[PDB]
Every structure is written in C-alpha cells, then in structure tokens.
Amino acid sequence: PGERGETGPPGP
C-alpha cells in the first residue's frame, strides 16, 4: 500500500 499502492494487485 505504501509500496504496491492502493491500486496495485491483490496479495497475501
């Protein structure tokens, strides 16, 4: 979220 972004892909 501070890395991948709120718009980034879902992740475990």
Epitope: G5, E6, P9, P10
Partner: antibody
Amino acid sequence: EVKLEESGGGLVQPGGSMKLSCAASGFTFSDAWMDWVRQSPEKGLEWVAEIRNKVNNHATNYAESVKGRFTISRDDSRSVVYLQMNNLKPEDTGIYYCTGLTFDYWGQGTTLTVSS
Amino acid sequence: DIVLTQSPASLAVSLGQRATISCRASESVDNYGISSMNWFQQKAGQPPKFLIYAASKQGSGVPARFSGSGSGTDFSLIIHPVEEDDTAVYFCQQSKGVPYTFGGGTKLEIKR
C-alpha cells in the same frame, strides 16, 4: 507532496531507439512499485511495463506488444525509473506517463512520436 | 487479458443530480477476496487521477461524492451530487493480474 517528472520524449525514425526517464520524490522510492502507461487516440490507456520493489526482487513485467523491445529499470539510489525502447514502430506513438505506487500517482507525461 | 467494457460512452447530467457509470469485465477481477477494480478521472490536458480502489474504497483525499460498487464482473462509479468541476472522462481499470488493463472511458458532460 508527491512529484513525478518524465523526460526524454520526442521524435524518432521507425526502427530507432529512445530512453525515457522519470524522477520521483515525496514517497519512499526504493519501496515503491513503478510503472509506465501510455495513451493514444487509437488504443486509449495501455499499461506498458512494471518494475517492483527491492523486496520483490525488482521483478519486471511487460505488455505483449512491447516484449523484447522495451526494458524497464530503476536506480533506487537516484530515485529514477528508466524505459529503454528499441525498434520503435508508428503505433508506439503516444503520451507516456510514469506512475508511482502502481497507479496511485501519475506524472504529467512526455510525448513520443515515431515518424520519418 | 481481461477486457473492460464501459457504458455509457457519454452522458449529460444536471448539477446536483446523480451520474452512474458502468464497467464490465470479460472475466472476474476478484482475487484474495478483493475485487481489483479502480476508477480514474481525466480532466482535459491532464493525467488520469486516482479516485476509487478495491471497487468501493475511496482513494486517499478523494471527495465524498465519488463512490463505487460491484464485484466479480460488474462494477459502477456513482457521482452524487454532480458539480461543474466533475466534467471529465472516467476510466475503470483492473489490477487482478498482468497485464493491467483500462476501460475505454466514459465522458461526463454537465447540463446548463
């Protein structure tokens, strides 16, 4: 405030090369996943390429239409992302945006025109 | 590739009314119990601006009047109340997996 600045667009002959680059500030750069997205009247918004953070091994991914020709990289020490584009074609023409935190933040864009 | 199809193509709404824009995916964008569907606003001469993520959740700092809904293949962006400044092209976009893909955009016009 977050700030992204693309550079190095312009004109180039079909078959030629071009290296775009993107300067980012306002967020922890080495943590961020960064992408390039392009926009044309013909194809709309196209995701072009992804580079992930240090934790994800700086993994890269590309759109099918650019694989083998485009390469995305980053210099975490300078807070910059590059996009090397080789063997350019007329349909590669468009506005190229550098995005940060996947698509949370967008640069103003730089224009690439492939024409003789 | 997941193909996103928007409707309507464009739309004209009066100030204070509701605008509803749809987005349909060719296959499910659900993954890890989250619908990976985002919405962007593009004003004229501007980059796209991030509004909604995970189908229904508002982006950090985004105004109250933009909200989203849906899951699986059918989603929508709702704007209520519509304002002068909301004239723009709205895109849906899918981050379930590579390649990430955008819709064709929907043009909102304000009636006056």
